[PDB]
Design a protein around this ligand. Structure first.
Ligand SMILES: [Zn+2]
Ligand SMILES: [Zn+2]
Ligand SMILES: [Zn+2]
Ligand SMILES: [Zn+2]
Lengths: 367, 367
């Protein structure tokens, strides 16, 4: 009888990026799906880029949001891992092929046929709409369980910003007590990198061009050290001291000074995306057996592991919780990195309020 | 009584690079030294670069050679690991600090205070002269044992060319049966990379701009496959097929086509040194969790391991054995990569012959 259900979200209609209400269909709960009421959605810079057509390949209407937390309302007839009332999360992926080496190794994020939460179509040919919405539907394999111990309002950023830095900290071996890791960029990603590295027992140094970020790094986040990258004496004092660097900056910046901070066998891991190629001198990689490497989000198994780790170790994103109807103002602030350090929309308490008509009640006397 | 001993070598006196006889002192055998009669010395491109003052920091007289094999003639009073008559090798390093984390982890080649076989001074303040000489003296820690099973004439290139590719094949995990590894550049380094990868049970593809190298790779070296990098269909057919690539080319070449050949989690290891920085687009490193990394030579323990491995598995460099007095002609040929694939000077059988006066005997009748 019922093949789709009605959902409501805030969506952009053109490259202005202006968000407004949008009513659309989602699939009804299939045998292996989970339907949930959205309670919080983090705001990612990718959300802004997509609604602004930054890559010239946005499909409008464009409904972003891929840091999605909520409460299960319906489970498919074959679903066993979730029950009604469970708190769940959805990140950047909602599908993959389940029969390639990456999928088979818990790396759906590197599946060549991965399906992103938005900027893509589902197997049904329907456009994928994200988490700035009241209701979400996801195949069970692509939902994670959120523990009771974890506050839901600050959990949401783990699903993209958190996993983006957790995954390479683990894969590149930058998670053992006593190591020294540098973090470049102190925005949403960078602040999660400091938090997870601290929780692993790693000594964390924030590297920044801005003297104002010293207070943020040291007093705000509890980083072990700060280097002002424009001060040559500070950069020189730190030559060859870092086991690795998580570089979160998606803007031009010089690479050689960062390679110099690395110890031999050190790893510069990029998780940001600068728009132009960067200039890589090979000799210093040879002389010190150094590397420059990349990573993107994380697979499902590790996403669940990370959530469990955060719950147990006390890791919490620093969030600014906002009503849905503030989202366009938030987007202007995100474009200036004017948040410490992530916006989270309180969908559960504010979304419907944003839809309620503000037409003043009146008799119509003038004819 | 005797603090130094007389040695003879062929040395350059200026940036012409022209080699001729040169008589000089080496230290007498100290308590932990090994003195040996040189039997073979491989010719490395670094030898040519140094004698030609390529880095503007050559000290003349310049006596290169760092692929040195010979027979022990004297051992210091505290030396136990070598005896008179043992066959020994010396590579690129003759000293290090023995009290840094790299030394303590068998990585004297990444010691900040490493002492290179030439282009450096020893602790005695004396200039280090290389292996194009009759007699060498080295601290025991920096000599390796050459097994009986290994022919000495083709062993010499293992000491630089061999270890340069063996070490990263091992460190970067490109040594397990069934993996697929690409080799860029089929000169001295590249041909050793094919040989070691084959011996590990790895499938090896040679990548080249030259159609002529197909026959060399396939018929000569026994590589599993060849890709002509100028043929777009061939490059496209091989997208995402390699676990890793050993790139031996010290010349400008495009990086993105090589990154494209890598599988997810693939590793492009550079062991050559292009003179300009290369252009590294970050996005493909992120999307596939790929890396670009470097390596230089190998530490002493691994050098010995490699020699033992070569002996046991039948690995032999393809060498052109030459007399000492041909070395200047060889240098012109090395500058054009006109060797398949390494020159080795037969010091033991030809060096003294190169010194013998060719003055014709005559009465002096014209006064
Ligand atoms: Zn994101
Ligand atoms: Zn897949
Ligand atoms: Zn060499
Ligand atoms: Zn050392």
């Amino acid at each position: 009888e019922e093949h789709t259900v009605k959902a409501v979200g805030w969506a952009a209609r053109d490259p202005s990026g202006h968000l407004s209400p949008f009513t659309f269909s989602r699939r009804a709960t299939g045998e292996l799906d989970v339907t949930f009421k959205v309670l919080y959605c983090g705001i990612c810079h990718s959300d802004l880029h997509y609604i602004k057509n930054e890559w010239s390949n946005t499909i409008y209407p464009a409904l972003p949001g891929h840091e999605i937390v909520g409460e299960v309302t319906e489970v498919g007839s074959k679903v066993n891992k979730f029950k009604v009332g469970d708190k769940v999360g959805v990140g950047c992926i909602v599908g993959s092929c389940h029969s390639c080496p990456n999928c088979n190794n818990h790396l759906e994020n590197y599946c060549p046929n991965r399906i992103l939460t938005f900027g893509s179509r589902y197997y049904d040919g329907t456009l994928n709409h994200g988490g700035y919405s009241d209701l979400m539907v996801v195949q069970e394999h692509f939902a994670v369980r959120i523990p009771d111990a974890l506050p839901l309002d600050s959990a949401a950023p783990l699903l993209c910003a958190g996993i983006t830095v957790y995954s390479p900290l683990r894969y590149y071996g930058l998670d053992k007590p006593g190591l020294h890791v540098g973090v470049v960029g102190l925005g949403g990603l960078g602040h999660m990198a400091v938090k997870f590295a601290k929780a692993f027992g790693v000594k964390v140094t924030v590297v920044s061009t801005s003297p104002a970020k010293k207070e943020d790094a040291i007093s705000g986040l509890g980083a072990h050290s700060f280097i002002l990258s424009t001060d040559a004496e500070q950069m020189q004092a730190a030559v060859g001291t870092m086991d690795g660097i998580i570089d979160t900056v998606s803007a031009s910046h010089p690479l050689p000074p960062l390679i110099s901070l690395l110890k031999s066998h050190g790893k510069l891991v990029m998780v940001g995306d600068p728009p132009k190629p960067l200039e890589l001198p090979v000799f210093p990689l040879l002389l010190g057996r150094k590397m420059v490497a990349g990573s993107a989000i994380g697979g499902m198994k590790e996403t669940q592991e990370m959530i469990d780790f955060a719950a147990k170790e006390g890791v919490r994103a620093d969030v600014e919780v906002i009503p849905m109807d503030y989202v366009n103002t938030a987007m202007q602030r995100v474009s200036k990195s004017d948040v410490k350090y992530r916006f989270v929309i309180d969908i559960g308490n504010t979304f419907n309020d944003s839809l309620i008509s503000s037409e003043v009640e009146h008799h119509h006397h003038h004819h």
